[PDB]
Amino acid sequence: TPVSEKQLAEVVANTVTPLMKAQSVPGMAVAVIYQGKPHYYTFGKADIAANKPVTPQTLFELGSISKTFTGVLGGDAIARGEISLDDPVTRYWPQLTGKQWQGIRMLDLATYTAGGLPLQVPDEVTDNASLLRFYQNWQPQWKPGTTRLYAGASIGLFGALAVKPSGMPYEQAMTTRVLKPLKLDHTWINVPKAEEAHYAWGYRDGKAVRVSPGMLDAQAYGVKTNVQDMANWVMANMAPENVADASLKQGIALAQSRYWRIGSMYQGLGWEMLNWPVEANTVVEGSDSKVALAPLPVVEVNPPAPPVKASWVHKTGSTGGFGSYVAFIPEKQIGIVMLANTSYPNPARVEAAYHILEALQHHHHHH
């Protein structure tokens, strides 16, 4: 039942064309990973005003898909013996002397279980001193390890602390330990002026926009990349047996380990996982912001379960002007990347991606 390029191209087009119309998406780049190989599909415009078409080289903002890079870099640090998820946060930031921090572990930051850290670091925070004030002033609503509340302020901090023992700035640690080893040479925390010709504009309510700088931006939402590098990132995570760098391979395994169970999802490091087989509605309902952003009770997996091959591993991510999603099933060696220059509802992303991967697993051969 080996699905031809043409039949794959038609499946993708048949889902993506109507999606971009219904959601008013100017531009989309799609990769489908199938039998060891990425396949690329591009639609519409990277830049409306200048009439520039999306290509497999166009850069998109990943928004929260950046957190998968943070989890893997953090896993690489663990594999290097530089940090432990079991360590108190104060071990890496002794300045966090507030009593509410006793009992909060690097594990908790990494997996949103610290007790209610907020969705974003406050816009008022502009430097180290104001960042410290923020964490020092923060009053948790729950005790550590009891409630998951998805938060860029939690994993963002985990990412900044993870790299401290390295003595490298985060961008340098990420480039040296993750991006260069995987040959992700068009993946940027800061897009160079030389690369700006490839950088899509984002769109929100008719306005051209790009993500604004912020504290812990690189760790929580600041990665930009094209559909080729993103496909290669998904492949490294889908088939870590192909990752020649040993500590990075082990980091990838740690980022897909199961730390907590929250209903039908398990929380990895940045990555989230549902067991396969999973029905569309279960994945789609999960991505609705009424569930995705809610504080929910966790069940600890003790010790953390190592990666399960029969998983739907995925991550959504947005910025003001961008909406993206990636998913893969390591058992089946298939996966999808959908990068867009408008932030449209997460359940619409998941439904499309799921439809395409389902159509790839249940293709017909009758003509």
From Swiss-Prot:
Q: Which InterPro entries does the entry link to?
A: Bact_CellWall_Synth/Modif, Beta-lactam-related, Beta-lactam/transpept-like, Beta-lactam_class-C_AS
For this protein, the Enzyme Commission number is 3.5.2.6
**Which principal EC class is assigned to this enzyme?**
hydrolase
Q: Please classify the protein's predominant subcellular localization into one broad category.
A: periplasm
The record's GO molecular-function terms, alphabetically, read: beta-lactamase activity
Q: Which residues form the active site?
A: 64 (acyl-ester intermediate), 150 (proton acceptor)
Q: What does the entry give for GO biological process?
A: antibiotic catabolic process; response to antibiotic
One cellular-component annotation, GO: outer membrane-bounded periplasmic space
Q: Which residues are recorded as binding substrate?
A: 315-317
UniProt family annotation: Belongs to the class-C beta-lactamase family.
User: So what does this one do?
Assistant: This protein is a serine beta-lactamase with a substrate specificity for cephalosporins.
What PANTHER family does the record tag this protein with?
A: BETA-LACTAMASE-RELATED (PTHR46825:SF8), D-ALANYL-D-ALANINE-CARBOXYPEPTIDASE/ENDOPEPTIDASE AMPH (PTHR46825)
Q: Which NCBIfam families match?
A: bla_class_C, blaACT, CMY2-MIR-ACT-EC
Q: What is this protein called?
A: Beta-lactamase
Organism in which the protein naturally occurs: Enterobacter cloacae
